[PDB]
């Protein structure tokens, strides 16, 4: 009994052609709807809980898409774009996804026509290149101008980017903190320096910016409460080496005939630890931190001689501290000298919400700070942290590039007008694709107004009419519920965000539309 021989595995799914492509477009639209509501000064956030039961709320779309583990292949590309934009420029990852989906949405009716996708993607590439050039032309610098403080642009940039996430009504506050903080980051510019500290409890209006380093951590040994916990003008000693009785040092068997020699051996071990402690004290410092655990006895000696100590401190915060007080971490206690000894304006350790924290700050030459982030919700901790991370990284980009553009979708409207006018010049099939490009691009204000509950058709129509002639930076104003020169209203976003957004969306459309069929393997 012979049988026909199969080509591929049993159940190898296949689906080819226009139905496959339109299915992909619909899937992208579905992904969009999961995020459509999100962006807006009156925008939105989602709550997603995992199978493990841990809740997670988010307003940044990229985080949400990470949580929405997508199985369908095409949408995985969109979620990857979300990761890309998140690593690049920040909010508008939301906007990025909406642009991608809407590009696909406008193209799909023409895909119903049997157009070879490559024509579509060629038009897309040309349009995107032209759009990027237009943005760069209408980019705005300030250091040419006169009425800019080197921070005012940064402050307003934070102002704009923030006012969609969970802390929107404290923007006038958080912008000042984040700008002043990032001003200290120079010139390493990397996020690892400034940690974020999710202290439980408290109203986030009470969240603290310290020109120094703090710990949410400690660990109880014998005397840790005994030693004084104020040090007005202290010297910081930083030990990586542990302080304990050969606890985890080199493993060795020892042999001793004379009992007195055995006595001498135990004495010599304790003399090792005493020698280390004497080196520490005679150093003249009073504060000692250690990655590795601290012997209780050494704690006792610090207590007796009024030195403060702590053990098991997480390494990242230790690096923060050493970069703060200027001292260098040490592993050899013997080679110690005053040069590697960090100094701080004042040291403390004060209760916040039941937790035992440590403080030292006021170091005039400290290029790294930290956020004590009060808040009554554990979920606020992650959400506020995400928002703050977006703020920090976007303001870093802004410092790097003195280029700003108006917000409120006005950029998108300007691009729409420019591209539509350009479309008249090129005859043939390209014209319709350019038109669809503009019609998809205009989506951003529409979603804004919809989440604002307005007649975005009146808004859009007035927008186009006024924006044909009257000024570049007119766009949606949420509170006045109509057009405004958002630029003067200080809705200021770095150009890089929108530029990268458009580029990513363009190549996303290229990728998706450049697919005809799909093969699945069990």
């Amino acid at each position: 009994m012979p049988t026909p021989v199969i080509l591929l595995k049993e159940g190898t799914d296949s689906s080819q052609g226009i139905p496959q492509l339109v299915s992909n477009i619909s899937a992208c639209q579905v992904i969009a709807e999961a995020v459509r509501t999100t962006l807006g000064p009156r925008g939105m956030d989602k709550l997603i809980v995992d199978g493990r039961g841990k809740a997670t709320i988010s307003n940044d779309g990229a985080t949400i898409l990470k949580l929405l583990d997508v199985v369908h292949p095409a949408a995985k590309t969109l979620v990857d774009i979300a990761k890309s934009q998140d690593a690049e420029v920040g909010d508008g990852t939301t906007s990025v996804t909406l642009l991608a989906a809407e590009f696909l949405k406008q193209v799909k009716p023409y895909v119903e026509e049997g157009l070879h996708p490559q024509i579509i993607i060629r038009a897309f590439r040309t349009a995107t290149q032209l759009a990027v050039n237009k943005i760069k032309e209408i980019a705005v610098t300030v250091k040419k101008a006169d009425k800019v403080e080197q921070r005012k642009l940064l402050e307003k940039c934070a102002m704009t980017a923030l006012s969609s996430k969970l802390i929107s009504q404290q923007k006038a506050f958080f912008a000042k903190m984040v700008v002043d903080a990032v001003m200290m980051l120079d010139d390493l510019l990397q996020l690892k320096m400034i940690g974020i500290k999710k202290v439980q409890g408290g109203a986030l209006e009470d969240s603290q910016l310290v020109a120094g380093v703090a710990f949410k951590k400690t660990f109880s040994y014998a005397g840790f409460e005994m030693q004084p916990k104020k040090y007005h003008n202290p010297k910081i000693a930083l030990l990586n080496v542990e302080l304990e009785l050969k606890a985890e040092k080199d493993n060795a068997e020892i042999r001793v005939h004379t009992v007195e020699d055995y006595q001498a051996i135990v004495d010599a071990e304790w003399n090792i630890l005493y020698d280390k402690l004497e080196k520490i004290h005679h150093s003249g410092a009073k504060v000692v931190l250690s990655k590795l655990p601290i012997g209780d006895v050494a704690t006792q000696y610090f207590a007796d001689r009024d030195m403060f100590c702590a053990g098991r401190v997480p390494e990242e915060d230790l690096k923060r501290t050493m970069m703060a007080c200027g001292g260098s971490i040490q592993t050899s206690v013997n080679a110690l000298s005053a040069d590697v000894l960090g100094r701080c304006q004042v040291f403390e350790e004060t209760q916040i919400g039941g937790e035992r924290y440590n403080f030292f700050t006021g170091c005039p030459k400290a290029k790294t700070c930290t956020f004590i982030l009060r808040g009554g919700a554990e979920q606020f901790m992650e959400e506020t942290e995400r928002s703050l991370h977006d703020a920090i990284m976007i303001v870093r980009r802004a410092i790097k590039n003195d280029s700003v553009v108006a917000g409120g979708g006005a950029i998108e409207m300007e691009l729409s007008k420019y591209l539509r006018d350009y479309s008249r010049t090129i005859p043939g099939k390209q014209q319709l694709l350019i038109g669809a490009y503009a019609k998809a691009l205009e989506i951003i204000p529409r979603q804004l107004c919809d989440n604002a509950g307005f007649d975005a058709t009146n808004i859009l129509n007035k927008l186009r009419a006024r924006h044909a002639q009257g000024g570049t930076w007119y766009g949606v104003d949420i509170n006045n519920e109509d057009i405004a020169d958002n630029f003067e209203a200080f809705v200021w976003e770095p150009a890089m965000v929108r530029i990268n957004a458009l580029t990513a969306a363009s190549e996303a459309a290229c990728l998706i539309v450049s697919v005809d069929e799909t093969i699945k393997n069990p």
């Binding site: 709807e33 023409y110 119903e112 049997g114 157009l115 099939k429 919809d450 975005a456 058709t457």
Partner: protein, 532 residues
């Protein structure tokens, strides 16, 4: 808060309805236009059914989602009213729904869209009646052939379209009928269609008369009669019952034999009364007993049993015979009159595909038309009879309404731009609905091109360009034209090409599509109930 099922609201259910409508559209999107490719259904058990006529597909396709059922019923109604456009009307409905939703999918208030749609339909039908072409000046048989063979493409028989159109027009002109005293109404389905696998449609023959799917009752009884003595008889032929309850009780046995004797002699005398008239042909839906058969053989007449009622009614209408449910008179005595007889030149049973069917040729009272199909399998034969039924339907429409429309999508070709211009008049928001109506209605050329597999955007653009030119320089006697083709993949003049469609097709199509859009668009929530 309802048990046994959840509910869905707003955007979810809107998108679901559009999704279903698009599904139904794509089910038939490949069977329209002179390059349409027919569908076929492995049923569940092998009794397949090839067909491209959309309404047939929808009826034979089980459907569960509500809106899809709505569209299916719309297709069925359209078939009950036109015959084709089930090629088209479903697509029109789905596309209008799609674009209307796309407007609504943004925010746009549905009732505004509905009002815009209503205006669109009224404007469109008015513009069509300003776009009409009258056939009265045109040669009758000419335009009839044109409309026929236009419908004949997109079907199995489009190739033989010329021959088939000739046959169809001959039949329909032969089935003339004087209506309400002022109308020359032509009855569809009056022409009889019989399928017979075997020879090709090349050899499929038109019958100048009527044809029976019946057989001679008695093999000894003759086969052909050159005389017209045709009597109809609903009244069945059995040695009669007592027919209600009449028990027969015997107290004098001497008479049982005579009782049984007349139990048949009653039928015997009825038959003899029938035959003494000289009728040589009898038909009967009711049963025919061997008693009658042998009598007929001895008389040499013609007898047929178990004929369908509609067929014998048509026989009476053709031969001029009178349907007779029984024998009776204004006086009680059961008699029969030669005046009841109908006539036809010759009646023959003939063997087509080793099955004997009965033919009736040239009834003198009223000319009748029947058509025999010849083909390879039963699949091709019954799908082509569906096609022919649509043919007769459209020709009936043409005759009933002396008015024709240029085929090949000139309709929406004009309509899109005309409605585009008219949209700005309203000034409200509804002109957006108007424009979307036009753009969606532009779907027909798109589907045409894709099924013809050429650059659809370019053909559509050229069409729109020609029509827009037809809306510039109002001296349009040399600037108004009409047309679109596929076989050469470029525009033409369908008026010259003969590609015509009946007006009522597009008119009723657009009206029903508008109603369907209004119904489905007003939806904003389904509530499910798991059964009892």
């Amino acid at each position: 808060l309802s048990v046994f099922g959840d509910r869905s609201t707003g955007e979810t259910i809107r998108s679901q309805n559009v999704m279903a409508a698009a599904s139904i559209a794509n089910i038939v999107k490949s069977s329209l236009g002179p390059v349409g490719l027919d569908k076929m259904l492995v049923d569940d058990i092998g009794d397949v059914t090839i067909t491209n006529d959309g309404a047939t597909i929808l009826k034979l396709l089980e459907v569960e989602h509500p809106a899809a059922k709505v569209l299916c019923e719309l297709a069925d109604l359209q078939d009950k009213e036109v015959g084709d456009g089930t090629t088209s009307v479903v697509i029109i409905a789905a596309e209008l729904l799609k674009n209307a939703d796309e407007l609504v999918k943004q925010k746009i208030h549905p009732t505004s869209v509905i009002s815009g749609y209503r205006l669109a339909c009224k404007e469109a039908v008015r513009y069509i009646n300003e776009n009409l072409i009258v056939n009265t000046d045109e040669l009758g048989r000419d335009c009839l052939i044109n409309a026929a063979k236009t419908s004949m493409s997109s079907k199995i028989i489009g190739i033989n379209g010329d021959f088939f159109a000739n046959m169809v027009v001959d039949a329909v002109l032969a089935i003339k009928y004087t209506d309400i005293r002022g109308q020359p109404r032509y009855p569809v389905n009056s022409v009889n269609i019989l399928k017979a696998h075997g020879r090709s449609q090349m050899e499929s023959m038109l019958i100048s008369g009527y044809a029976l799917n019946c057989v001679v009752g008695s093999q000894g009884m003759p086969k052909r009669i050159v005389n017209a003595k045709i009597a109809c008889l609903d009244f069945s032929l059995q040695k009669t019952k007592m027919k209600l309850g009449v028990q027969v009780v015997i107290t004098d046995p001497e008479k049982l034999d005579q009782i049984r004797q007349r139990e048949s002699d009653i039928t015997k005398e009825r038959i003899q009364k029938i035959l003494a008239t000289g009728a040589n042909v009898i038909l009967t839906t009711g049963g025919i007993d061997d008693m009658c058969l042998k009598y007929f053989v001895e008389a040499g007449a013609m007898a047929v049993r178990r004929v369908l009622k509609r067929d014998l009614k048509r026989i009476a209408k053709a031969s001029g015979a009178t349907i007779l449910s029984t024998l009776a008179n204004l006086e009680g005595e059961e008699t029969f009159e030669a005046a009841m007889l109908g006539q036809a030149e010759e009646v023959v049973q003939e063997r087509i595909c080793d099955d004997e069917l009965i033919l009736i040729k040239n009834t003198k009272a009223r000319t009748s038309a029947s058509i025999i199909l010849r083909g390879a399998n039963d699949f091709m034969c019954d799908e082509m009879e569906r096609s022919l039924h649509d043919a007769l339907c459209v020709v009936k429409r043409v005759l009933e309404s002396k008015s024709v429309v240029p085929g090949g999508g000139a309709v929406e070709a004009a309509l899109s731009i005309y409605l585009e211009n008219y949209a700005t008049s309203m000034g409200s928001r509804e002109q957006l609905a108007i424009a979307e109506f036009a753009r969606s209605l532009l779907v027909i050329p798109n589907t045409l091109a894709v099924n013809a597999a050429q650059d659809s955007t370019d053909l559509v653009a050229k069409l729109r360009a020609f029509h827009n030119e037809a809306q510039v320089n109002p001296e349009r006697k040399n600037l108004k034209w009409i047309g679109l083709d596929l076989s050469n993949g470029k525009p033409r003049d369908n008026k010259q090409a003969g590609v015509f469609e009946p007006t009522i097709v597009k008119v009723k199509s657009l009206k029903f599509a508008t109603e369907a859009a209004i119904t489905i668009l007003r939806i904003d929530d389904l509530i499910k109930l798991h059964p009892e």
